[PDB]
Amino acid sequence: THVLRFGGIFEYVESGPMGAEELAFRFAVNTINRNRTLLPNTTLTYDTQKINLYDSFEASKKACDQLSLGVAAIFGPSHSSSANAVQSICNALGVPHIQTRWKHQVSDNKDSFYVSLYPDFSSLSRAILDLVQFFKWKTVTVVYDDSTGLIRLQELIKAPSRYNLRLKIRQLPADTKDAKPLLKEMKRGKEFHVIFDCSHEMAAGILKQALAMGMMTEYYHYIFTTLDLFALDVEPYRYSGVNMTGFRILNTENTQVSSIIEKWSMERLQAPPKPDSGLLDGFMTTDAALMYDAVHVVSVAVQQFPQMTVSSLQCNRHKPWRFGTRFMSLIKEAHWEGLTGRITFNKTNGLRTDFDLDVISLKEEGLEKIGTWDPASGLNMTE
Amino acid sequence: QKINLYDSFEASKKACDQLSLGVAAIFGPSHSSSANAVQSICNALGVPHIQTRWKHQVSDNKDSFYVSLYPDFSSLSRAILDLVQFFKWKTVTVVYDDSTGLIRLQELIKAPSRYNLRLKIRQLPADTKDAKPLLKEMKRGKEFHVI
């Protein structure tokens, strides 16, 4: 019957195996094909290209090749520089660029052929601050990894002039093994209330150092910026009495979503897990649930545009895709219940600014839900 | 070659044209996204890319065919802090324009845990004409010392 091709560009270091993102992409396409409610008369196909991390030149070439083969959208690469380059190309040839990861939005940048499935920083920033205020903290130490961490917490950093929060800002070193000296200063400083802004792999690492340092006890409360908090091996810490609170956008309470995350673990967990990681093996991370959701949301849009077909476009020529403008518009209007909850983009900038978070905390039983957050309600804690 | 601001695609094309004419270096464009794209190209073809403006350095980025004549942020950050400490300020309000402002002052923002500076962080609005309400808060707040 009818057929439509998507492009995929996935970043990696060294060689195989496949990464979580490229895997979720493929997995979403195979699943949707078998669904008879979604794209009934339509069958999805794809080209996948692999590139080095941070080689925007290579990302450009591969994107141009794909636009030449003909594709209805490029689920372009993840990291800032390659992603900005594929986005500019996609904008010139009017093919939608689908992003899954946050990158810094420049105001005076006029690109309009992209949406981003990642929960925007502005909203996450607010939900961190909302949580802090609910715990009634007046003192807090924000610890971040790299520069862009600062930007994710700007709403929080600017609070000390409106509300009554004194706050200290510290930076992690490159390696978490180097983090004892920093933790010792916090300990002497009696900095019991701490927000860690950093990847979940950094967070697994910094917790081990915190245990070594006598800082996983009832005296300490840690808020985690990472959405992959639920991926942390928490077996070493749940008996200790520390408080760990963070957020989760992956909708694991829904039974339909749990069964999907499982089928994933079977084809994935089948491959390399690590012992000294401090992460659960075969948990579906957020980077990958978002890619899988992106392939669905875009498909909901394809259903509403049966006329559309792919064209072989050349980066040489300034001739855009006929159907681009209309397709991009359908994607931004789209609505979908996926692995990560309500998906809905912002009319204005195509950023995902409205979404639903579960709020999770460490109880002795493990990490469990204790409320919700959404930008219009603030917290809905269930005391 | 002249290009639009923020069109990294056009910057790529023009850089490729120039490498085709033949050039010993590209004094590539100023702004982050176009500059990163011309730098990646210059790195693949081993022609030096000469920059004049700061852009955020990613650690795990392996490009080596570029130098930047702009005074690095790390050093400027320190010199701001050095000056504040010479004026013996214990209170200071940092006012920044856009996100990347934060990064240029990180050395300063992390000082309140080592030295004795309490500090308040405020952001300007898009337009300075919109800035009276912000300045009124600083005035009521007795924020006399301001970066």
UniProtKB/Swiss-Prot annotation, chain A:
Sumoylation mediates kainate receptor-mediated endocytosis and regulates synaptic transmission. Sumoylation is enhanced by PIAS3 and desumoylated by SENP1. Ubiquitinated. Ubiquitination regulates the GRIK2 levels at the synapse by leading kainate receptor degradation through proteasome. Disulfide bonds join 64-315. Residues 1-383 are extracellular. Highest expression is found in the olfactory lobe, piriform cortex, dentate gyrus, hippocampus, granular cell layer of the cerebellum, and in caudate-putamen. Belongs to the glutamate-gated ion channel (TC 1.A.10.1) family. GRIK2 subfamily. Homotetramer and heterotetramer with GRIK5. Tetramers may be formed by the dimerization of dimers. Assembles into a kainate-gated homomeric channel that does not bind AMPA. Can form functional heteromeric receptors with GRIK4 and GRIK5. Can form functional heteromeric receptors with GRIK3. Interacts with DLG4. Interacts with NETO2. Interacts (via C-terminus) with KLHL17 (via kelch repeats); the interaction targets GRIK2 for degradation via ubiquitin-proteasome pathway. Ionotropic glutamate receptor that functions as a cation-permeable ligand-gated ion channel, gated by L-glutamate and the glutamatergic agonist kainic acid. L-glutamate acts as an excitatory neurotransmitter at many synapses in the central nervous system. Binding of the excitatory neurotransmitter L-glutamate induces a conformation change, leading to the opening of the cation channel, and thereby converts the chemical signal to an electrical impulse. The receptor then desensitizes rapidly and enters a transient inactive state, characterized by the presence of bound agonist. This is Glutamate receptor ionotropic, kainate 2. It comes from Rattus norvegicus. The gene is Grik2.
